[PDB]
Amino acid sequence: TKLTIWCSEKQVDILQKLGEEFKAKYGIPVEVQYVDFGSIKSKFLTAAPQGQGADIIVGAHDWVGELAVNGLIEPIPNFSDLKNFYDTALKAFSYGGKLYGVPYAMEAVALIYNKDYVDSVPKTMDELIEKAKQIDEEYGGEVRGFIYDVANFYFSAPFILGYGGYVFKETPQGLDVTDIGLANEGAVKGAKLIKRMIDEGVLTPGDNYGTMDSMFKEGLAAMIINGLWAIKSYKDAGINYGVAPIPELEPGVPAKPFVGVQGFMINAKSPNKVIAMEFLTNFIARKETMYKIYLADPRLPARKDVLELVKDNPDVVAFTQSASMGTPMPNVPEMAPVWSAMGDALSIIINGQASVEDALKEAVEKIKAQIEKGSHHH
Template sequence: MRKFAVILLVALVTLIFAQQKLVIWCSEKQVDILQALGQEFKARYGVEVEVQYVPFGDIKPKFLTAAPQGQGADIIVGAHDWVSELVANGLLEPISSFAEINQFFETGLEAFSYGGKLYGLPYALEAIALIYNKDYVPQPPKTIDELIAIAKQIDKEFGGEVRGFIIPATTFYFVVPFIFGYGGYVFKSTPAGLDVKDIGLANEGAIKGLELLKRFVDEGIITPGDNYEIMDSMFREGRAAMIINGPWAIKAYADAGIDYGVALIPDLAPGLVARPFVGVQGFMVNTKSPNLALAKEFLINYIAKKDTMYRIYLADPRLPARKDVLELVKDNPDVVAFTHSAANGIPMPNVPQMGFVWGAMDDALNLVVNGRATPAEAAKTAVERIKAQTQ
């Protein structure tokens, strides 16, 4: 009798699912693989999956308009920093813990968490790392002191024709690994989420990070005018030995014939790792979807699986969010290095107040590298400005 009841339940669930259709909105790179996965899901469960291409920049605003009316996509694919706005508008469904959640990098899960709940299934990470030219640096430095020593030697040997080390000196995103590595933070992380009233960009660790930036300038390794365009073009031209950049830049370096390597940003001190910002892409469920249970089932018991995530990686080769998928691609040293850098990192805050941080901190970096304020003074001014705009 019990066996018959189970069979009846499975048949009933199959019948209900067969009457439903899942709609997914995604950007161009995910369309083909999600269509293929959707066809397989339909063949297995009898549920139609309709994948609709929406330009990446249009997904969130279109969803904000359609979802409150019970329309639009059941699932969207997008960035983790959409979460706060979508949750505030009551449009995202929390995802409960599932069997293989521990296979996902904590950084990815943290990125899609808000108010202590998980609101997205991560599939791809993004972070910066050290990129080095093997013609000048056969083995990457393990510590910042080693990096400085190597950079100085190259500067001296080539008389400025080749730069030992370059970063965009006044761009917060590229200086963050030093600030966070020493213990600075943007907004305090708590079990209930980010505390936007607790800003850690002028604490002792943040000031140490800015002091390191000033050391680079004072010792002639970088200049106040160093920006992304200078860094990127000099590395492509073989005139920079070490830079910090992201996976988006690798193809251009390979096409330019640079014999490059990717490594972790060197430790700030023994056991004190650099911690870059991390961006995360993932799947989010429309809480107003008429197919809510099915949408969650599709993500947790189909998309979240190792084999499926590996196929998504092959179709859209970004840094994998699952640890065991990284094991499958460990023969790609670039992916391994960038992913380990991301695993060390901190997700970009997924709260709207983050919008006020970028300009304030870029201005603070300008003050520091041009000698117009001490690191402590510049950090204090930046935090006061952020607080005035956010609180």
């Protein structure tokens, strides 16, 4: 009789502290295990059917459909505190008419900049590119003017979607997963802006999340694209940072980031589901508990009465502005192959191995082929 939780490095300390509180009040020990974020879903897909998955996992709402149709996460029954959560957060964790998690936070990326190098936020992507090149020259390559995880579709989406790409078409009958918008004229235009930044040398093909995040924390990157999950580490590193929406792609044409929702899901195969349900609906979901989570992991709260406490914080203001321009990630099982296909296309594009139009058409054909083959069933 023990509850086990898998989560990323950002939640481990606070969830272990809250787990000791739950042990004091209910008598049940809680063990929190770090698992790298990019492996949680894959490890759970192989472990849970074997009886070796955690009771509770913490992660992003795009996973919900794939996990639900494979029978691996438990629906959450209605409970009266749900009226206090934002509908956008509850819809993101809903699939097939059922709620499949308790959300704790919403998030989007934004432009994060180091005020020691950036005095005026660029208003357009053209101005950002010019400012990055000036920094690159001024400090002789010791400081990067602009860097981000370029070949990760999650981080490059604001440019693709902003110009009119889309993942699946919205219809009155739901998402049409045969109508994929990732190689339309808008997607091409957004992918060409990415290529232009490579060609002009402000990004490189080797740029990745770890080097971005490390360089910013060391004071050697002026401008990055990242989310609220990183800001505490940058405050703790003593960086004098600011946050703004991603600059418009052209005048009057905004970037359009994904919106994500982070949340708690229960393993349907757990022998401890009954206690896991109490933990989530009668302890984690409470206003006081959700505010403690915010203090340790300061993303946008999913409960309105907690957001109300922190709504004046300038980081909350800026990231709310970014998220307001965004679109929630789809959560249908068919999202699963999209990330790999688009990551491969972006790698090809930035390495000059194919034209933008060709690389995106190949990506869409590969996604269609995976959907047709039922790759999302395990």
